[PDB]
Write a protein that binds this ligand. Structure first.
Ligand SMILES: Cc1ncc(C[n+]2csc(CCOP(=O)(O)OP(=O)(O)O)c2C)c(N)n1
Ligand SMILES: Cc1ncc(C[n+]2csc(CCOP(=O)(O)OP(=O)(O)O)c2C)c(N)n1
Lengths: 330, 342, 331, 328
């Protein structure tokens, strides 16, 4: 076992897929000689060169469309947005040119492409650099949307994303880049894959099901550890995939715990938690709920700059515990 | 009663931008190529006229942009490239779908939204795809970066293939086109940017809009003039000199709007007709025999497109993802489940 | 003294009356001037107000949308039309990052009075790239206000409120509703007719089930309610009108009487409008009043197909609403 | 000496027959004002750099040190009734457009005394006729064209300066703004801040049909004169214009150039400019301590200022039981 950060785990994933398939290449801003805007692609340009690691100008709509074009022509690009806030300039290419193309062609033109980059809140980057796009991209047919949390999640999903013959959006997290995790030998392998569409239970529990994705999954584990000292066993579930989400794992947990709380970083209205709550109500686990499911989300505001204000615009550990204790009437 | 095998023709001189020498002003057209180009243009013409008829009869729904009057472009460009080269355009792709190899039956059945269509009735007028034909695209300007990426794959694979990336003059102010100019020149992509000008914008010299990319303005009603410019632009990209911009000046047929003064003087089928008869490449009776065969083939295809049934409802969710296992998609409510197969 | 007025005419009345009221109001977009409007919504406006107030723009979505937002920052009140809202994705950064968030980031110093209007959602044979509904996307974002009119009253009252609001307002219209006539009462014909943003309207009183919808499917809900009424099932059809901030008090008050809830929408199911309504009803005071789980009627989970039989089954039909209602009521 | 004439570099032209003059007159009063303004911006960015390295400032903090001849030179060529907008490197322009050093630094440190009450940070600071910094690159360029549209709309002969860096010069929306600005003859001055990924580095030519001029951005007198020329061009109704400002310390510091020019021509003494350095340096330390000792904004104001001219309402916090009051 090794100590591997999520940033190093993504670097391992992309490196192994570049070495495996010469049709795979990476393009984006500062991905080459700068070693990555967040050092995620460090050393890749020194290993593969201008042909496979392509520094692009600040022209989001332009190089995203260029990536999709190369994907239609038979290549397997990795298109990095510096943050996904900047993907809104290219979101027409993601949705209309990439996601919908295979369906419109009647099964003739596939688009094997990956859109990766950090997503959601950071630290002091204010309103225009803190938006979470999990619900937006998960809303669209023809896409696959994933949101890794730890190092295992990051490497396994980035490798599945590249090998999938369809557009995959990889919503990363900047604050998770530098966090180390125990990396078991199974994750160090070049054949390590995490299938898209299956969630992982990070903690077994019996009193309440807590579902989350990306960085707040760690806060759920912190909350569950505090509540465990009080006799409350939380079952924390890591979505991993946003579309198509693994509701069967959530439903099976709710049928055991009889309680559900969703935790997400993005905005509340029409967000990820809203879909999970609608699905349990339409689904077979609704009769097993002994209390309504509640959503823990970010504040319904543009992200403020000040440290004290941003801290209260993001789900905190005490916010998860408070919602959990409300659900259990304790 | 004697037919010349070939004939030399004077072609219009292209206006240049950042180029010292342009395409030749003379070209050789053989009898076989003339008859081939003529049959191809007359097929595209009768196909668009039939589509216009079905559109008025409301058999075709939604959009139906016709390319009649521009037959020298889609046929002229095909004569100047290889089947192993790549091409992409916007929403007016009926002619290019036929010139890139699809049959008139497939194109009309797709227009009428039937199971026999090239896209199985899923795409309609704007989304028809073929081998090395990356289709029409409904979002204006979006196909220009897509084509630049296809040119990137051409350079990536190193088989000396080029990509033709077309856009109309109305799309010439899309910002993503200027982003594609800069990247294509920066990486020397074998991309031929083609602006289809129909005769809003502070500069109407579309062949100069690439600034650093050289351009040439071509008469798009002369098929031989388009063929020679395409051969020039394709050779330019194959030499590794990077991208090139090409403006095709054409006119669309779809009182003051008399404008028979474009059909009478500048119709691309009539120009190739007059050139071949005066140079003894073919007879007037020969070209009328071709018109009859083409008209019969379109009515036979239109009959197929009219009688062909709609796609089955069971295939509504088919082909969402490629190379994926089967799954179910949600319908109008949670009790409607459509099976999705790659 | 009522008149028959189409939704297209009601929007035209709204914009015309606000242009005459405030010289800072102007309309820009593609084909809005000499072409009389891509869907004839802005007919006659250019002949009345001229090049200064009705501005034909090139096909440069990101560009002229940003120009509108810029003009709004300098004190004007633009009306930015997208020919359809599929094409707004090219300009969506200006709506979200430049317009919605600015007043908050400025600390309350720089307001952005702007309206984004145009048809939204499915049409007829326009395929996947021209049929997307953006109600959930725009409703997801703070600093915006999102409305979705249905009939002629909705269109004129909301378009006038959108122009008078000092903040970015998105008006998601519907092309298939443009040509539909409705009885236009004398109160709506006035130049002072306003429909407040954030309040829903009950289109039909009922006691057996609450049916909430917005835009064109509201008419299908009324058609379903008329069919079920002959069978002894009284539906309470609710027209949201506003997507953000939606009127949950009106839905909650209805559920407390009917004990059943069905949402009907045209857009995609996952993370859509119905998902928020269902999540909010579960978090709210009305959850204990439900005698059955709330179900969602949405569009099919696919890119919009072209074929008539396929497109018809990718959109909620009246029988699909009746089917969901009878499932909820177990009849 | 009361005044003195100075030689300024000749601008390279694009689609212009006659350009800005190659000589200009600088008065003693303007020189001392330009020097104090430039020296204040310099000491302010160095102080912010220290606080940024000390992590007192969070997130982004793009500094404009070395570009003091731009924001001060541009302000000397425009009126307070003119309009200006730029990207994320807006600290200098915030001060030249009327905000005090205390407000800028307190906003950088995220305190209630900031100009945006700690809500915006480094990239989103607004002032009178200053439409702020913008975090999305290129997005501010169409915005400036719209501000120029309002200038023409109101018809009081006001202009808008729209700045963008050389790294953003390949944003497609800029070319969309070029085409519409020339089409409608908008009084928009497109300004590309060039320092040292682009097929063409002649940024003053990228407007094609829009005329351009390339200016020495290290010479404050050359920036002022080129700006007056571009402003007069837009006020005459000739439409937009594009202006490229090119912006080592041994013989290119903009403060060192103006300092040497005024002393050699007896416009000021070395002792005067040193006494101004002391006055400016004291003002920076006084503002920095205020920005450090000032408390954070109160949590009760987290939801304030979401909509303008609206009634009060409450917004949802981290969970459905946290409610923040929102006031316009
Ligand atoms: C990005 C985008 N903006 C706007 C439109 C709407 N639109 C489609 S074609 C077109 C041009 C008008 O159609 P046509 O009569 O064919 O003129 P042409 O296409 O020849 O310019 C417009 C405005 C679009 N399809 N995509
Ligand atoms: C549209 C957009 N794309 C990408 C980014 C991310 N980004 C911010 S600054 C930057 C490069 C600028 O770096 P620096 O040299 O510090 O600033 P400059 O000298 O370019 O002004 C990038 C890619 C952005 N802010 N906006």
């Amino acid at each position: 076992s090794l100590q591997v950060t999520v940033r190093d785990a993504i670097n391992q994933g992309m490196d192994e897929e570049l070495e495996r398939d010469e049709k795979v290449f990476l393009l984006g801003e500062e991905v080459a000689q700068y070693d990555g805007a967040y050092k995620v692609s460090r050393g890749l340009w020194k290993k593969y060169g201008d042909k496979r690691i392509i520094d692009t100008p600040i022209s989001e709509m332009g190089f995203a469309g260029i990536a999709v074009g190369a994907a239609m022509a038979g290549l397997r690009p990795i298109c990095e947005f510096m943050t996904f806030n900047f993907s809104m300039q290219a979101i027409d290419q993601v949705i209309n040119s990439a996601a919908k193309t295979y369906y419109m062609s009647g099964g003739l033109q596939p688009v094997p492409i990956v859109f990766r980059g950090p997503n959601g809140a950071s630290a002091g980057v204010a309103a225009q650099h803190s938006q979470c796009f999990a619900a937006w991209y998960g809303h669209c047919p023809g896409l696959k949307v994933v949101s890794p949390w730890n190092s295992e999640d990051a490497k396994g999903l980035i490798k599945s994303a590249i090998r999938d013959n369809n557009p995959v959006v990889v919503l990363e997290n900047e604050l998770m880049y530098g966090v180390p995790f125990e990396f078991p030998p199974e994750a160090q392998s070049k054949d390590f894959l995490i299938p898209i569409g299956k969630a992982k239970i990070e903690r077994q529990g019996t009193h309440i099901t807590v579902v989350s994705h990306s960085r707040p999954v760690g806060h759920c584990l912190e909350a569950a550890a505090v509540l465990s000292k009080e006799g409350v066993e939380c079952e924390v579930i890591n979505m991993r995939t946003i579309r198509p989400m693994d509701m069967e794992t959530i439903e099976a947990s709710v049928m055991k715990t009889n309680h559900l709380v969703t935790v997400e970083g993005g905005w509340p209205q029409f967000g990820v938690g809203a879909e999970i709550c609608a699905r349990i109500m339409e689904g077979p686990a609704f009769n097993f709920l002994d209390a309504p499911a509640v959503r823990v989300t970010g504040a319904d505001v543009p992200m403020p700059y000040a440290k004290i204000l941003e801290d209260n615009s993001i789900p905190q550990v005490k916010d998860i515990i408070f919602a959990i204790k409300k659900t259990l009437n304790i | 009663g004697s037919f010349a095998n070939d004939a030399t023709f004077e072609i219009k001189k292209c206006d240049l931008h950042r180029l010292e020498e342009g395409p030749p002003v003379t070209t050789v057209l053989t009898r076989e190529d003339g008859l081939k180009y003529y049959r191809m243009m007359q097929t595209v013409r009768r196909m668009e006229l039939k589509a216009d008829q079905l559109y008025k009869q409301k058999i075709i729904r939604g959009f139906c942009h016709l390319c009649d009057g521009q037959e020298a472009c889609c046929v002229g460009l095909e004569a100047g490239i290889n089947p192993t080269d790549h091409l992409i355009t916007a929403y007016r792709a009926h002619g290019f779908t036929f010139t890139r190899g699809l049959s008139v039956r497939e194109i009309l059945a797709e227009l009428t939204g039937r199971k026999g269509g090239c896209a199985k009735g899923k795409g309609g007028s704007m989304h028809m795809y073929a081998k090395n034909f990356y289709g029409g695209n409904g979002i204006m300007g979006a196909q220009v970066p897509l084509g630049a990426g296809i040119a990137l794959a051409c350079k990536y694979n190193g088989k000396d293939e080029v990509c033709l990336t077309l856009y109309g003059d109305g799309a010439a102010n899309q910002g993503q086109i200027f982003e594609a100019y800069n990247m294509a020149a920066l990486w020397k992509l074998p991309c031929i940017f083609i602006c289809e000008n129909n005769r809003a914008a502070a500069s109407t010299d579309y062949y100069k809009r690439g600034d650093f990319i050289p351009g040439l303005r071509v008469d798009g009603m002369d098929i031989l003039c388009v063929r020679e410019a395409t051969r020039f632009a394709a050779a330019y990209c194959r030499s590794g000199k990077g991208p090139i911009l090409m403006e095709l000046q054409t006119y669309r047929y779809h009182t003051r709007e008399e404008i028979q003064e474009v059909r009478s003087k500048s119709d691309p089928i009539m120009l190739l007709k007059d050139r071949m008869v005066n140079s003894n490449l073919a007879s007037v009776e020969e070209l009328k025999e071709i018109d009859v065969e083409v008209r019969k083939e379109i009515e036979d295809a239109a009959q197929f497109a009219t009688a062909d049934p709609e796609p089955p409802l069971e295939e509504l969710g088919y082909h969402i993802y490629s190379s994926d296992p089967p799954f179910e998609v949600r319908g109008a409510n949670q009790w409607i489940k459509f099976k999705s197969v790659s």
